[PDB]
Amino acid sequence: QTTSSPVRVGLSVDASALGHTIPPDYTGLSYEQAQMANPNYFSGANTQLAGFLRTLGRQGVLRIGGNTSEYTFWNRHREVITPEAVNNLSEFLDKTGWKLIYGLNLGKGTPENAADEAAYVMETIGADRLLAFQLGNEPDLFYRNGIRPASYDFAAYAGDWQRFFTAIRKRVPNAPFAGPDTAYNTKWLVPFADKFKHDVKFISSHYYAEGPPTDPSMTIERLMKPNPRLLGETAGLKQVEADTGLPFRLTETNSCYQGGKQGVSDTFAAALWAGDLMYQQAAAGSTGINFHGGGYGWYTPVAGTPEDGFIARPEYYGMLLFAQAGAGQLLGAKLTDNSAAPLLTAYALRGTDGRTRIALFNKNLDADVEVAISGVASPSGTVLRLEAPRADDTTDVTFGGAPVGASGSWSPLVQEYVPGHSGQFVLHMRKASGALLEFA
Numbered sequence: 001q002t003t004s005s006p007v008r009v010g011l012s013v014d015a016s017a018l019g020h021t022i023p024p025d026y027t028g029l030s031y032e033q034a035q036m037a038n039p040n041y042f043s044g045a046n047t048q049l050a051g052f053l054r055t056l057g058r059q060g061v062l063r064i065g066g067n068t069s070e071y072t073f074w075n076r077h078r079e080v081i082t083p084e085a086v087n088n089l090s091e092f093l094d095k096t097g098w099k100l101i102y103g104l105n106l107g108k109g110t111p112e113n114a115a116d117e118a119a120y121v122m123e124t125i126g127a128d129r130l131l132a133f134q135l136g137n138e139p140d141l142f143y144r145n146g147i148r149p150a151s152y153d154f155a156a157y158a159g160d161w162q163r164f165f166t167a168i169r170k171r172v173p174n175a176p177f178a179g180p181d182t183a184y185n186t187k188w189l190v191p192f193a194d195k196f197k198h199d200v201k202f203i204s205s206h207y208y209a210e211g212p213p214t215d216p217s218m219t220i221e222r223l224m225k226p227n228p229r230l231l232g233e234t235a236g237l238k239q240v241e242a243d244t245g246l247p248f249r250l251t252e253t254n255s256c257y258q259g260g261k262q263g264v265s266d267t268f269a270a271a272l273w274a275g276d277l278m279y280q281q282a283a284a285g286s287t288g289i290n291f292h293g294g295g296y297g298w299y300t301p302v303a304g305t306p307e308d309g310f311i312a313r314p315e316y317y318g319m320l321l322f323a324q325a326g327a328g329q330l331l332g333a334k335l336t337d338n339s340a341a342p343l344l345t346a347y348a349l350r351g352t353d354g355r356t357r358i359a360l361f362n363k364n365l366d367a368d369v370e371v372a373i374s375g376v377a378s379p380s381g382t383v384l385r386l387e388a389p390r391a392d393d394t395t396d397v398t399f400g401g402a403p404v405g406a407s408g409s410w411s412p413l414v415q416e417y418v419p420g421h422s423g424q425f426v427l428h429m430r431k432a433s434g435a436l437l438e439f440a
């Protein structure tokens with residue numbers, strides 16, 4: 001490609017500037033526990049949904065919990081989870097190769113019912129595929145729903161958590177746990193890590209780009225800019241890790257609250273946001289991510305049902321770019337001369353296969369860019385482009401010149417070499433686009 005009047009920026013790759021190593025199970029999705037009320041959703045029979053997950057990664061994590069986990073009640077025979085639903089989830093995990101984070105009902109359920117449900121999950125799914133149980137979702141927001149009274153605080157929650165933990169461990173001596181399954185904060189997450197650091201495997205935190213309802217309204221323009229609250233919360237998590245030894249995973253995230261915002265969450269801009277977010281958190285030392293979704297929600301990566309079929313929504317294509325990059329070690333990638341295109345981001349990666357890759361997100365809505373790439377020595381680079389004709393498009397999204405098809409079927413159909421002369425490369429990118437470069 002060539003662009004009309006592009007902003008000419010410099011990208012310098014430094015193979016000696018070592019960052020974090022991306023784990024092979026970094027990618028992931030978060031779903032409502034209420035989906036378990038239908039044993040045909042997370043099922044070996046659901047070959048469509050299993051195909052979408054395999055395309056997002058050979059390894060990844062399925063997280064089940066969410067606000068419906070305070071209303072879902074296990075029974076060995078308001079939503080009900082049966083042995084049959086847990087048996088079918090086991091077969092779904094076998095078909096996808098993914099590992100499981102499983103919510104237990106601390107909001108409305110009993111310690112003894114949680115221990116009974118955990119025992120059946122451990123009996124059926126087993127220790128290798130079960131990563132963690134979580135004891136409630138967003139306990140700091142229990143009062144907003146009246147699930148607890150306004151007086152409920154960290155002290156109260158810690159009492160609940162200990163009662164559930166003790167009851168579960170009696171039934172399941174090897175039960176693994178994560179928490180506290182909420183947004184970063186000083187009154188809940190920091191004291192949780194201090195008190196329970198010997199009882200959990202990792203810290204589970206949540207992130208939504210939209211702020212409180214009294215923040216300025218979320219637009220595509222705002223979604224593309226840096227989020228200083230995200231940088232702060234991520235620093236907070238790094239310090240918990242230094243203090244307690246506990247790594248962190250982002251177990252529930254998406255663009256906007258309450259199932260997302262029409263004209264923002266369901267748009268190609270969400271592919272750029274989600275792809276960029278995956279790399280920003282991996283570079284910060286996060287162990288992984290779980291994009292919330294289900295049904296036909298505005299922000300869901302995968303939409304549909306077993307009866308009607310499943311489709312890749314725009315956000316899925318951001319996650320697909322990450323999937324095709326693969327795992328490896330992050331490297332130095334500094335941008336210069338980039339003040340008139342400030343929302344361009346770039347991430348360089350030494351792939352586990354030994355090839356250098358670069359993931360670029362041109363999140364500038366009104367500036368095409370020309371990137372002069374130094375610090376890569378290769379006889380040939382290829383580009384796969386992440387594209388839609390407008391940032392607010394709800395469809396027309398392609399990666400490598402192709403849409404995702406049925407059951408997550410994808411492969412690239414457009415081959416493009418990156419122009420190379422004097423040990424350097426020059427890549428044009430349209431406004432609001434992304435690219436994955438791979439060097440021989």
Ligand SMILES: *[C@@H]1[C@H](O)[C@@H](O)[C@H](OCCNC(=O)C(F)(F)F)[C@@H](C(=O)O)[C@H]1O
Nearest residue numbers: 032066067137257258259293294295297
């Ligand atoms: C985290 C919370 O745990 C989620 O339950 C909540 O999702 C509510 C909307 N649900 C959906 O879109 C569904 F059902 F999955 F399709 C999200 C959120 O507010 O979006 C968050 O609070």
